[PDB]
């Protein structure tokens, strides 16, 4: 359940206003 | 929600860590077994008693080779 | 802030960090943000950037002063050692991404091993450039300076030595095949001692101006 | 007033830089404190104080070049070993927001001695280039613990790469072109002409490494003479005719001495 | 969940045979995990962390004693377990060395002081 | 409302369009960079006064410099002033203190004023001497295949974070043959 | 205090004119011996008028400072610095009951000061590789001790610790500080040196036989002191 929520795709843009962990 | 899946990349960044944390001190685990002891240690159990059955179990593929 | 900096130590000075052509990348501004001793961090890290945005002036006077064949290959080759000084500055900010728990220590340890680099071939450049060696005897100045004693500062003058060499490889396939001399200008014709390293013996030009002359006749 | 500000200080302290509410007084004394956590403290900036004595001596021999080749490994051999010494800070600097094991003591503990054998290890070495400074290291390798001799054995093997790259540079060429007296072999400005084989090479004493006998340094000067000798006069050639190092001197050494003295 | 459904999943990771291949070893191992099911000495994370940095060491790598302090502070960092010592204890536990005393290594207290 | 609403939710329209960003921000330094540099204004007493910018992120900056370097003109950054492309400081994101930030959109625009004259020149020959015409064709030549690159890379920002940094170093080996 | 500073050179004179080949004997600096920082032992109020079940946490709380060596709160080192002795002394205004358990728990302090002098006095090298390997191995268990006593401190700050499970917890660490510090006495009192203290841990391992629990530390000792040798 873990290991089958677990193969989701995750953003790799990454912001500007939010340097510090955006999602 | 939103808040509740950056839990779920929050815990895969925590069991990749694991994953690293398992694969230098050359254990014969991988991230899916890793995955059924953290469940397990979840409803709590002994590390003694899972290291105890992983020694066990692993020599029942020397039990028949 | 955690890009901030990683802005100033490239070729962009910022106002924090104000350019000076007596000495660049001075912090004078007060943060009451930060840590008093944050100050002296940023004070070893700005020696580093410093050095980085000097060597991009250098390139930028030149590609009659300082002119030639060979300084339009010195400079070339101080583009080539820059390059993973960029590529680490990239992965700083990958790492600053996912982690802003890091500090100006972390910065200043990764680009510890360009503080062995930097420093020794910075002062090759400013004696390069104080002194009026346009010719020939630069390449003695990098071999002077290349054996070294650290052996950081010991390979990269060897690849920037290098080119220069095959610069001068196809000076001599000219000359000892197509019987052409004066296929550069310095800074009957022979080679001199300005167009001469100072580690090829005396012989061999001797040797190769006969070969050349020959092809003539 | 809190423990926690002066974990604060204490972390910048280990670079040599000064807190915010401990700072130096004087150099030669330890840090100053701007009840047991007061006691505690002094010991932790012990470290710094023997961390600046080292990041002194590298910062200034670095850019010496008057000190020899062997002398800069020696900055390199010292910069490199400083340079795990802040993977350990940043790890530190991170874990800010329990963090006290004896105010971290049990961790700073197996770098203290690392520090105090280096801060030694300058000294011993103080105003030395060549063998002496290789005869430097040597002294600390008649030791009885794991730790100092694994210590040693690292830098020793950093410091002696230069005197074997000359040492080759004298069996297959035999031509001496150094320029700072880090070789045992004196070759003489004039360029005799019978004298050749008498005069021209002179055995220097004081660079002779403490990893290579008399016997062997007096040896291979007679293979680099033999090889000079074959090229001024002679004019024949065959292009490049040829602890411990764990008995790799003894191996080449005779051989090529062998041959060398054959062919001519 | 159950606890058996998960020791059965963990029978079928370790050995590839089903659950009907094999059972033999299931049965026993229920029997060893039974009353097992909660800390019996101390639970204190801090000990099988400085216990981690010693099982690093007797590697002979010292760049990776200090990695684990940064994963360390990942785990508390986004603190999704509950319990992170049991799991760190396992994986020093099933430790191997790619390469009698006690009073040389941190051991723990057996808890006839504290209830478990 | 159903057309306007559909506009501010899933377009942007924030700085190009006048309408202040709503763009949403999760405070704390690298990114409120803004707001502790007035806070230390105020303790150094400035006193107030009032800067007025317009609140953008940075990629669409990117996207614009990348438009301006490939050969189109009359974007809404940079103000031009006879002719000559010059940075505006009327734009502003919340780190880079806002001076780092004029200091690179000057560099890309001192590119950019060297790429408009030549399209301006090639522009001019469109509305016998045959030998300027033969030239152009070849300058145009450059331009087009120039112009591939960057619109492929402007792509690649829809479907992945892309900085400053990687726009300028990427462009090394063209900016190289521009001089 | 002021005797090994002597000693040190006249070894060194001796072992240098000993020698058939070579000069060079090494050697460490002043500071190494001079800094009291580098060893692990160096409000105002009377406590007694306090009520009962704070004195106990205070007591515990500069009692495991002590215990590394660095001063208390309501607790003084007293001046000798000579020999392997080192007492301290808690206030005298204290309960008796707490004061009498306080007398029992200091021997893990004076067998924990006596065993730093030693390893730092005798890091020099007139006493050879053997005794170089010897302070090799009893610097780990400081080192042990260091790993307990942390973990105690993060015990008290839960509100879990008293003064009676302390005295247990810390009698198994007692004892085998009491065999190193009974070991350095021994051996600085001979002037054992060379293979004349490689004798001793021989014999000391035949003399625990039935305990097994010091029995194998003396056999870790002799196991790392006869490897130069």
């Excluded at chain 3, 022979?190 to 190769?208: C, F, G, N, Q, W």
Aim: proline share 4%; with cysteine.
């Amino acid at each position: 359940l873990w290991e089958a929520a677990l193969t989701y795709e995750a953003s790799k843009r990454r912001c500007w206003e939010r340097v510090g962990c955006p999602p | 929600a939103a808040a509740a899946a950056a839990n779920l990349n929050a815990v895969r960044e925590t069991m990749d860590v694991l994953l690293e944390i398992s694969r230098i001190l050359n254990t014969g685990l991988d991230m899916e077994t890793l995955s059924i002891c953290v469940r397990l240690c979840e409803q709590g159990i002994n590390p003694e008693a899972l290291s105890s059955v992983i020694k066990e179990l692993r020599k029942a593929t020397e039990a028949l080779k | 802030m955690i890009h901030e900096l990683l802005l100033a130590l490239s070729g962009y000075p910022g106002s924090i960090f104000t350019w000076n052509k007596r000495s660049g990348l001075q912090v004078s501004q007060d943060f009451p943000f930060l840590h008093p001793s944050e100050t002296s961090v940023l004070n070893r890290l700005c020696r580093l950037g410093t050095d980085y945005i000097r060597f991009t002036e250098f390139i930028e006077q030149y590609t009659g002063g300082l002119h030639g064949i060979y300084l339009r290959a010195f400079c070339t080759g101080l583009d080539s050692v820059l390059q993973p000084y960029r590529q680490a500055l990239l992965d700083l900010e990958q790492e600053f991404l996912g982690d802003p728990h890091l500090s100006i220590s972390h910065v200043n340890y990764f680009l510890d091993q360009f503080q062995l680099l930097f420093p020794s071939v910075m002062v090759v450049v400013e004696q390069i450039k104080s002194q009026k060696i346009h010719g020939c005897q630069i390449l003695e100045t990098v071999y002077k300076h290349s054996c070294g004693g650290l052996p950081p500062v010991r390979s990269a003058l060897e690849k920037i030595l290098a080119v220069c060499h095959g610069v001068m490889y196809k000076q001599l396939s000219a000359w000892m095949l197509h019987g052409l001399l004066l296929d550069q200008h310095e800074e009957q014709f022979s080679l001199r001692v300005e167009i001469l390293p100072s580690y090829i013996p005396v012989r061999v030009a001797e040797k190769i101006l006969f070969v050349g002359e020959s092809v003539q006749m | 007033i809190t423990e926690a500000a002066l974990v604060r200080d204490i972390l910048y302290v280990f670079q040599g830089i000064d807190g915010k509410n401990i700072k130096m007084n004087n150099t030669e004394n330890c840090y100053k404190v701007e009840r047991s956590l007061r006691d505690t403290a002094v010991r932790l900036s012990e470290l710094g104080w023997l961390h600046n004595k080292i990041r002194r001596y590298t910062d200034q021999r670095s850019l010496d070049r008057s000190f020899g080749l062997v002398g800069q490994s020696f900055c390199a051999a010292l910069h490199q070993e400083l340079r795990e010494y802040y993977r350990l800070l940043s790890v530190l600097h991170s874990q800010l927001q329990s963090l006290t094991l004896r105010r971290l003591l049990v961790w700073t503990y197996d770098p203290k001695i690392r520090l105090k054998t280096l801060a030694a290890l300058v000294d011993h070495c103080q105003g030395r280039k060549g063998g002496e400074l290789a005869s430097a290291v040597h002294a600390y390798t008649k030791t009885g613990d794991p730790y100092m001799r694994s210590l040693v054995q690292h830098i020793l093997s950093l410091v002696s790469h230069p005197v074997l790259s000359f040492l080759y540079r004298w069996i297959y060429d035999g031509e001496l072109e150094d320029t700072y007296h880090e070789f045992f072999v004196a070759s003489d400005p004039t360029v005799k002409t019978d004298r050749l084989w008498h005069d021209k090479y002179t055995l220097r004493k004081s660079m002779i490494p403490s990893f290579m006998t008399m016997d062997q340094s007096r040896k291979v000067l007679l293979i680099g003479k033999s090889i000079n000798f074959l090229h001024q006069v002679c004019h024949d050639q065959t292009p490049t005719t040829k602890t411990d190092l764990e008995n790799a001197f003894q191996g080449k050494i005779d051989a090529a001495y062998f041959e060398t003295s054959k062919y001519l | 969940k159950s606890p058996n459904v998960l020791l059965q999943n963990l029978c079928c990771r370790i050995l590839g045979r089903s659950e009907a291949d094999v059972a033999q070893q299931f049965q026993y191992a229920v029997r060893v995990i039974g009353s097992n099911f909660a800390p019996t000495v101390e639970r204190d994370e801090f000990l099988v962390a400085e216990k981690i940095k010693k099982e690093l060491i007797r590697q002979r790598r010292e760049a990776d004693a200090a990695l684990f302090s940064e994963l360390h502070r990942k785990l508390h960092s986004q603190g999704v377990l509950k319990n992170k010592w049991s799991i760190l204890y396992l994986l020093l536990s099933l430790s191997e060395d790619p390469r009698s005393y006690a009073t040389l290594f941190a051991q723990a207290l057996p808890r006839d002081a504290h209830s478990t | 409302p159903d057309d306007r609403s559909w506009l501010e939710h899933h377009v942007v329209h924030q700085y190009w369009t006048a309408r202040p960003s709503q763009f949403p921000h999760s405070l704390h330094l690298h990114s409120n960079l803004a707001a502790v540099w007035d806070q230390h204004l105020y303790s150094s007493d400035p006193l107030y006064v009032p800067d007025d910018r317009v609140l953008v992120t940075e990629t669409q900056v990117i996207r614009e410099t990348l438009w301006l370097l490939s050969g189109v003109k009359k974007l809404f950054i940079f103000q031009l002033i006879d002719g000559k492309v010059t940075v505006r400081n009327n734009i502003i994101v919340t780190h880079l203190t806002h001076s780092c930030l004029r200091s690179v959109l000057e560099q890309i625009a001192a590119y950019g004023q060297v790429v408009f004259r030549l399209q301006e020149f090639i522009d001019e020959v469109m509305g016998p001497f045959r030998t300027y015409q033969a030239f152009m064709w070849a300058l145009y030549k450059y331009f087009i295949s120039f112009k591939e690159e960057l619109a492929e890379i402007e792509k690649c920002i829809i479907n992945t974070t892309i900085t400053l940094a990687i726009v300028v170093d990427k462009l090394a080996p063209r900016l190289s043959q521009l001089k | 205090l002021q005797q090994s500073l002597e000693l040190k050179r006249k070894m060194l004179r001796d072992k240098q004119n000993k020698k058939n080949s070579g000069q060079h004997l090494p050697i460490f600096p002043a500071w190494v011996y001079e800094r009291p920082a580098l060893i692990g032992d160096f409000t105002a109020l009377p406590i007694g008028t306090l009520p009962l079940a704070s004195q106990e946490s205070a007591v515990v709380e500069d009692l495991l400072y002590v215990l590394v060596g660095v001063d208390g709160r309501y607790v003084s080192a007293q001046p000798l610095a000579g020999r392997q002795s080192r007492t301290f002394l808690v206030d005298p205004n204290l309960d008796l009951s707490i004061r009498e358990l306080v007398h029992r728990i200091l021997p893990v302090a004076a067998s924990y000061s006596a065993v730093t002098r030693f390893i730092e006095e005798k890091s020099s090298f007139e006493y050879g590789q053997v005794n170089h390997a010897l302070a090799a191995a009893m610097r780990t268990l400081v080192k042990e001790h260091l790993i307990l006593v942390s973990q105690l401190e993060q015990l008290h700050r839960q509100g879990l610790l008293s003064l009676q499970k302390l005295w247990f917890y810390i009698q198994p660490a007692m004892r085998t500080m009491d065999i190193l510090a009974s070991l350095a006495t021994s051996v600085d009192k001979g002037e054992c040196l060379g293979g004349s203290t490689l004798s001793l841990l021989h014999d000391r391992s035949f003399s625990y036989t039935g305990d097994s629990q010091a029995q194998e530390l003396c056999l870790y000792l002799t196991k790392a002191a006869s490897a130069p040798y």
